[PDB]
């Protein structure tokens, strides 16, 4: 489907069928730099431990 960025920002993954959006994960510690990135269909709500940011364009995360 779409393409989002790996942890390595110079390499992307193709999203699975049905998934569209690109998400990145933070930890409450390192809010500055996200720790994991991938594709998803529905943007996961923020947790107490890790924060989720999604965006609806390619290689945005």
CA dist., res. 34 & res. 24, Å (int):
6
Is-contact 34 23, C-beta < 8 A? no
Superfamily for domain range 1-61: CD59 (2.10.60.10)
CA torsion 35-38-44-50 (nearest 10°) is -10
Is-contact 7 30, C-beta < 8 A? no
Residue 20 phi, psi dihedral angles, 5° rounding: -135, -50
Q: Which helix (H) or strand (E) holds 28?
A: none
Q: How was this structure determined?
A: NMR
Is-contact 20 1, C-beta < 8 A? yes
Burial of 19 (0-12, 13-18, 19+ CB in 10 A): middle
């Amino acid at each position: 489907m779409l393409k989002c960025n790996k942890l390595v920002p110079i390499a992307y993954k193709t999203c699975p069928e049905g998934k569209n959006l690109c998400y990145k994960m933070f930890m409450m510690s390192d809010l500055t730099i996200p720790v994991k990135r991938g594709c998803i269909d529905v943007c996961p709500k923020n947790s107490l431990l890790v924060k989720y940011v999604c965006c609806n364009t390619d290689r945005c995360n």
